[PDB]
Scaffold this active site. Structure first.
Site, mmCIF file in Angstrom:
data_model
loop_
_atom_site.group_PDB
_atom_site.id
_atom_site.type_symbol
_atom_site.label_atom_id
_atom_site.label_comp_id
_atom_site.label_asym_id
_atom_site.label_seq_id
_atom_site.Cartn_x
_atom_site.Cartn_y
_atom_site.Cartn_z
ATOM 1 N N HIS A 41 0.898 14.072 37.835
ATOM 2 C CA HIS A 41 0.750 13.497 39.188
ATOM 3 C C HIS A 41 -0.532 13.924 39.883
ATOM 4 O O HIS A 41 -0.647 13.566 41.062
ATOM 5 C CB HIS A 41 1.971 13.813 40.069
ATOM 6 C CG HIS A 41 2.063 15.238 40.543
ATOM 7 N ND1 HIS A 41 3.054 16.098 40.109
ATOM 8 C CD2 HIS A 41 1.350 15.929 41.470
ATOM 9 C CE1 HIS A 41 2.920 17.266 40.714
ATOM 10 N NE2 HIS A 41 1.898 17.193 41.545
ATOM 11 N N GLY A 143 0.091 22.956 46.358
ATOM 12 C CA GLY A 143 -1.031 23.317 45.520
ATOM 13 C C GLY A 143 -0.693 24.217 44.356
ATOM 14 O O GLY A 143 -1.583 24.525 43.551
ATOM 15 N N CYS A 145 1.271 23.403 41.873
ATOM 16 C CA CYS A 145 1.567 22.665 40.656
ATOM 17 C C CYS A 145 0.555 23.058 39.583
ATOM 18 O O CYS A 145 -0.594 23.384 39.895
ATOM 19 C CB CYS A 145 1.560 21.171 40.932
ATOM 20 S SG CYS A 145 2.980 20.693 41.945
HETATM 21 C C1 LIG Z 1 2.282 20.290 43.579
HETATM 22 O O1 LIG Z 1 1.401 21.385 43.833
HETATM 23 C C2 LIG Z 1 3.429 20.234 44.603
HETATM 24 C C3 LIG Z 1 4.163 21.580 44.778
HETATM 25 C C4 LIG Z 1 5.288 21.488 45.813
HETATM 26 C C5 LIG Z 1 4.750 21.380 47.243
HETATM 27 C C6 LIG Z 1 5.608 22.327 48.094
HETATM 28 N N1 LIG Z 1 6.330 23.124 47.128
HETATM 29 C C7 LIG Z 1 6.169 22.707 45.875
HETATM 30 O O2 LIG Z 1 6.658 23.253 44.897
HETATM 31 N N2 LIG Z 1 4.345 19.209 44.121
HETATM 32 C C8 LIG Z 1 4.617 18.116 44.812
HETATM 33 O O3 LIG Z 1 4.148 17.912 45.917
HETATM 34 C C9 LIG Z 1 5.545 17.118 44.183
HETATM 35 C C10 LIG Z 1 4.752 15.865 43.803
HETATM 36 C C11 LIG Z 1 5.291 14.700 44.622
HETATM 37 C C12 LIG Z 1 6.412 15.254 45.485
HETATM 38 N N3 LIG Z 1 6.520 16.684 45.169
HETATM 39 C C13 LIG Z 1 7.402 17.558 45.666
HETATM 40 O O4 LIG Z 1 7.433 18.739 45.360
HETATM 41 C C14 LIG Z 1 8.420 17.006 46.636
HETATM 42 O O5 LIG Z 1 9.218 16.096 45.872
HETATM 43 C C15 LIG Z 1 10.300 15.497 46.432
HETATM 44 C C16 LIG Z 1 11.455 15.277 45.687
HETATM 45 C C17 LIG Z 1 12.561 14.667 46.277
HETATM 46 C C18 LIG Z 1 12.488 14.295 47.614
HETATM 47 O O6 LIG Z 1 13.542 13.682 48.243
HETATM 48 C C19 LIG Z 1 13.245 12.630 49.158
HETATM 49 F F1 LIG Z 1 13.824 12.608 50.349
HETATM 50 F F2 LIG Z 1 14.137 11.807 48.624
HETATM 51 F F3 LIG Z 1 12.249 11.804 48.894
HETATM 52 C C20 LIG Z 1 11.327 14.520 48.346
HETATM 53 C C21 LIG Z 1 10.217 15.097 47.754
HETATM 54 C C22 LIG Z 1 5.538 14.744 43.110
HETATM 55 C C23 LIG Z 1 4.774 13.596 42.450
HETATM 56 C C24 LIG Z 1 7.016 14.884 42.734
#
Ligand SMILES: *[C@H](O)[C@H](C[C@@H]1CCNC1=O)NC(=O)[C@@H]1[C@@H]2[C@H](CN1C(=O)COc1ccc(OC(F)(F)F)cc1)C2(C)C
Ligand SMILES: *[C@H](O)[C@H](C[C@@H]1CCNC1=O)NC(=O)[C@@H]1[C@@H]2[C@H](CN1C(=O)COc1ccc(OC(F)(F)F)cc1)C2(C)C
Lengths: 306, 306
Positions: A41, A143, A145
């Site tokens: 991603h 950040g 990831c």
């Molecule tokens: C990458 O560095 C980042 C790390 C996270 C940010 C905060 N803590 C973390 O571990 N990953 C990241 O942003 C992933 C990216 C986007 C969304 N994401 C998430 O971590 C949040 O995902 C998520 C899952 C379910 C959800 O439920 C809702 F309501 F339904 F939509 C919301 C958000 C990737 C591509 C998964």
């Protein structure tokens, strides 16, 4: 003596972390030989993250769109490919710090150390288990990831986890190093949730043995129990079942302490039914479940790594 | 989000650990520039350890009595001297892996990461605080003497601890890198004990703020309290007093969360008087006290090290 949640020394992995920037996304990558591994991603943006067709997103990239920045040296990308949920960026330089390593896919209940990183720079190290529901209860901010989890075994690094996302409940989800997710999660911002978790029974029992080796003997007894009757009480407290394979695994610890595995189960039974009643075990007021039988033996006898 | 007991990345220190053998004693040493630091009781034997006159023991040594073995390469010793309770062995080679470093002597209640080592090879890494009684609750087996504790701060390693001994209660005692002991301990096998410990109040409050940043809000309230009236309740539960300097320190966390320090003290008051009543904070059923205000901010905002 003493018993601490111990991580492996992080040095061999620190020499592999790099920063990967594409578009408006920065995350961590893992540089081994001439390849940089990172979550796919990174080729997304904010409006991408809803429902990407990562194949569409990547056919549209060039090599020069990927800034791979290894501290103060820029790594030229010369090829790219996707394996499941990770990118493999081929770079013109092989990492001279590449340790002996393996990619392994671990079972739930096994433990590993996580080197949290930002902008390719390590922030800290800590120990985690893979929960029975294939989440991990980590510490991850935006950040992070691309940070990996790993075990060391003599001189070889077994990489077993790469961080991808946080779920609404505040737990964490990711892949093995071949980019297959642990659990039913997908790298999309859509409705997902973790599934009911359970306590890792065999680990608790190992942790109780750790306690006995270290002189905590207040929770012991003479009662014994059958494996059948133990598992009837475990299922009522949301613990996973105990298998004979778990029992055999606990053999060396049982032998060292002189306490039969099934006797230690009789102890755990009464701790689940009575609580602890002010006492603490190994400085914990909860039954701890992120120490494997291996972790206990390793720590209680001083194994090292070269 | 998430909150874990996080150690610093150990790589810079791993490149400094060496093995030091004199007579029938093997322990760890710390190799920086052309000097190897290690506990002076390496020049002892078993019948020495009762009451040594380490000056007598060392005037009787030659350089060639000290095997300093740096992995697979032997380091020739060319001089030796004693500073307080550590030896400084001058060797003919300077460690090319010497990081930027400092020797610092920490105050009780500050925290640091410990790289446990055996035979000059790192075994694991974990976080510790210096207790108010100048012990640390570590994890140390025979042969771990010479392991160090440290903090990292950008690219500089601040070394603050070298391991020397375990006390009968199973806690651990050692020196700063200039060989002065933390607390009233001496490097002799005679009757010593740790002194009454207390809980590190300012750390608990930082850990409560960590909890609020991470969404645990069940222990909050509107009650407030004066610093005076808070410290009257703390002394009854064996907590250290809270100073205005502690209060000011807690300023940034108070500001980020919107909860006045004195309001968080009112929370802690009722947690001490009522217990938690089944609830847990940050996956802990006890009030945790080995996180500094700095540790919380660092982790809850993602600081790294180069
Ligand atoms: C990458 O560095 C980042 C790390 C996270 C940010 C905060 N803590 C973390 O571990 N990953 C990241 O942003 C992933 C990216 C986007 C969304 N994401 C998430 O971590 C949040 O995902 C998520 C899952 C379910 C959800 O439920 C809702 F309501 F339904 F939509 C919301 C958000 C990737 C591509 C998964
Ligand atoms: C060095 O590697 C070793 C590490 C300890 C061994 C087990 N765990 C450890 O942390 N240190 C070591 O052996 C020191 C050496 C000898 C004694 N010692 C101890 O750790 C035990 O000391 C001790 C203190 C008090 C005490 O009380 C009794 F009853 F009065 F004598 C007994 C033993 C040095 C020189 C302190």
């Amino acid at each position: 003596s003493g018993f601490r949640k111990m991580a492996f020394p992080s040095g061999k992995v620190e020499g592999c972390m790099v920063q990967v920037t594409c578009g408006t996304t920065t995350l961590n990558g893992l540089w081994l030989d001439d390849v940089v591994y990172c979550p796919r991603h990174v080729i997304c943006t904010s409006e991408d993250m809803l429902n990407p067709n990562y194949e569409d997103l990547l056919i549209r990239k060039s090599n020069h769109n990927f800034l791979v920045q290894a501290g103060n040296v820029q790594l030229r990308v010369i090829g790219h490919s996707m394996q499941n949920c990770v990118l493999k960026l081929k770079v013109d330089t092989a990492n001279p710090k590449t340790p002996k390593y393996k990619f392994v896919r671990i079972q739930p209940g096994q433990t590993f150390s996580v080197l949290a990183c930002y902008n390719g720079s390590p922030s800290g190290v800590y120990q985690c288990a893979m929960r029975p529901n294939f989440t991990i209860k980590g510490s991850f901010l935006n950040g992070s990831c691309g940070s990996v989890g790993f075990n060391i075994d003599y001189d070889c690094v077994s990489f077993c986890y790469m961080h991808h996302m946080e779920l609404p409940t505040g737990v964490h989800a990711g892949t093995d190093l071949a980019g297959n997710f642990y659990g039913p999660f997908v790298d999309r911002q859509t409705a997902q949730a973790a599934g009911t978790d359970t306590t890792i029974t065999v680990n608790v029992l190992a942790w109780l043995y750790a306690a006995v080796i270290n002189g905590d003997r207040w929770f012991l007894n003479r009662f014994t129990t059958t494996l059948n009757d133990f598992n009837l009480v475990a299922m009522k407290y949301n613990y996973e079942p105990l298998t004979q394979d778990h029992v055999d695994i606990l053999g060396p610890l049982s032998a060292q302490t002189g306490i039969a595995v099934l006797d230690m189960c009789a102890s755990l039974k009464e701790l689940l039914q009575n609580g602890m009643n002010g006492r603490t075990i190994l400085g914990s007021a909860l039954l701890e479940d992120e120490f494997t039988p291996f972790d206990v033996v390793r720590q209680c006898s001083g194994v090292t790594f070269q």
